[PDB]
Write a protein that binds this ligand. Structure first.
Ligand SMILES: CCN1C[C@]2(COC(=O)c3ccccc3N3C(=O)C[C@H](C)C3=O)CC[C@H](OC)[C@@]34[C@@H]5C[C@H]6[C@H](OC)[C@@H]5[C@](O)(C[C@@H]6OC)[C@@](O)([C@@H](OC)[C@H]23)[C@@H]14
Ligand SMILES: CCN1C[C@]2(COC(=O)c3ccccc3N3C(=O)C[C@H](C)C3=O)CC[C@H](OC)[C@@]34[C@@H]5C[C@H]6[C@H](OC)[C@@H]5[C@](O)(C[C@@H]6OC)[C@@](O)([C@@H](OC)[C@H]23)[C@@H]14
Ligand SMILES: *[C@@H]1O[C@H](CO)[C@@H](O)[C@H](O)[C@H]1NC(C)=O
Ligand SMILES: *[C@@H]1O[C@H](CO)[C@@H](O)[C@H](O)[C@H]1NC(C)=O
Ligand SMILES: *[C@@H]1O[C@H](CO)[C@@H](O)[C@H](O)[C@H]1NC(C)=O
Ligand SMILES: *[C@@H]1O[C@H](CO)[C@@H](O)[C@H](O)[C@H]1NC(C)=O
Ligand code: NA
Ligand code: NA
Lengths: 210, 210
């Protein structure tokens, strides 16, 4: 039995990873986003830049990658290279650099109901602002703002999977403690009649250790 | 031929101005907002407060105030005191004072298809920020941010009627010229699962006259 092979061949026989996988163009595709903070690599106070190591988990539905489990011997999920499927082009809007790191290879897990889960590591560089005004009163506020590069909110709509950045895999920094990393979702539209532009923003608040 | 009286009695026989006028409470009510800037009453640079005179036009559909024109001898619109109908409780979120004007009497125009139009004057007081960085390089940025006080975005959703503040009725200020008043719509939601909170913001940019 080569059921996974057969399923793969059946699924991608006529599949384009360039196309937002909705049946209807003016229907939206929803993506949830989870940010896991691995490590504060550097809080540069000279240039006010945070370099962080992150994991990004994106979850969405692909209308064209579903199957009947009964036709494939009960097989209900497969893990494949991520570049085989359409992926949301979510990026850090407020990146401080135009520097491009070489893309690590990643995989997606594809479930029989078209549910796709994608974990990817990332090094981010972004500006922070000193804050000595709000509790705990000796801080660096480091916003991380994420969204689609090319799709508006009626094409790809983005949601926070969690109330905050995920700190459960975090390794402590000797100089900075993480006070909080609350997540919000912003949507802006211009004038009467523009398309909506959503983001999710994590406000990483760092407290200077004493 | 007292058709307007007959219509009024028929419309308001069993009507409550306390209830958001949707047939299904889980459905949204859409409101469009137009701001007309009448006058800059005071640009207080000591306290960084703008006092402005505005007209606010709100338009929305009332599901319970529709009628068949052909049943009322073709009557298709009536003008009545505004406190007779449910009204959106849109307010200036970023008001600077406790501390409001005594409310004046206003009217709404009610169209046969349930479309209600409501003009009301307002005196607003709000903080501004000095800006000498961006063109035209000697400015006051005065944001005016409006939204419902008690309803979230799934209950009452607000939209800009125009691309900008309406300046067609504006009387010039001797000290300040209006450089622009672009309008945007912002929506924020907190964490994974909160309701959405929309506003419309007018960024009134004032240029100092030399
Ligand atoms: C295709 C690249 N794309 C990147 C953009 C980038 O958007 C952002 O950076 C951004 C989005 C929401 C909130 C804040 C944002 N932001 C930041 O956080 C930093 C940066 C200054 C900024 O604008 C994504 C959304 C939209 O594309 C769907 C853009 C807008 C759509 C439209 C707008 O034209 C003015 C605008 C674009 O300029 C080009 C487009 O022209 C067809 C775009 O490049 C981005 O503008 C910043 C903006 C477009
Ligand atoms: C009922 C009064 N209402 C006024 C508020 C006030 O909202 C704002 O001032 C506001 C809204 C959007 C964007 C920016 C806003 N804002 C500010 O919050 C400060 C600044 C002046 C400003 O512009 C409207 C939205 C929501 O109510 C539907 C509120 C929130 C809903 C919820 C939130 O608490 C968890 C929050 C409230 O505190 C109370 C509520 O608890 C039942 C509320 O009073 C306002 O918070 C500022 C906020 C609520
Ligand atoms: C996208 O998410 C919103 C909010 O949960 C939901 O109402 C809508 O039906 C979703 N649309 C699709 C196509 O999944
Ligand atoms: C950081 O992001 C939060 C959430 O969007 C926002 O309220 C705050 O103003 C941002 N901080 C700065 C300095 O822009
Ligand atoms: C509210 O407005 C949007 C257009 O922006 C529309 O799609 C939606 O159907 C409207 N809802 C109601 C109840 O009018
Ligand atoms: C004024 O409002 C605009 C539009 O929402 C916003 O981008 C800008 O940051 C605001 N300015 C200040 C000083 O809050
Ligand atoms: Na959110
Ligand atoms: Na708008």
């Amino acid at each position: 039995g080569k059921y996974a092979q057969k399923l793969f061949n059946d699924l991608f026989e006529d599949y384009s990873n360039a196309l937002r996988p909705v049946e209807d163009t003016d229907k939206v595709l929803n993506v949830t986003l989870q940010i896991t903070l691995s490590q504060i690599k550097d809080m540069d106070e000279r240039n006010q830049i945070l370099t962080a190591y992150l994991w990004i988990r994106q979850i969405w539905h692909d209308a064209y990658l579903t199957w009947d489990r009964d036709q494939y011997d009960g097989l209900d999920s497969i893990r494949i290279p991520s570049d085989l499927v359409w992926r949301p082009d979510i990026v850090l809007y407020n990146k401080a650099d135009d520097e491009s790191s070489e893309p690590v290879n990643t995989n997606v897990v594809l479930r029989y109901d078209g549910l796709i889960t994608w974990d990817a590591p990332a090094i981010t560089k972004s500006s922070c602002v000193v804050d000595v005004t709000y509790f705990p009163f000796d801080n660096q506020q480091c916003n991380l703002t994420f969204g689609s590069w090319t799709y508006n909110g009626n094409q790809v709509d983005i949601f926070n999977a969690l109330d905050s950045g995920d700190l459960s895999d975090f390794i402590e920094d000797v100089e900075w403690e993480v006070h909080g990393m609350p997540a919000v979702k912003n949507v802006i539209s211009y004038g009467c009649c523009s398309e909506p532009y959503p983001d999710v923003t994590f406000t990483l608040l760092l407290k200077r250790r004493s």
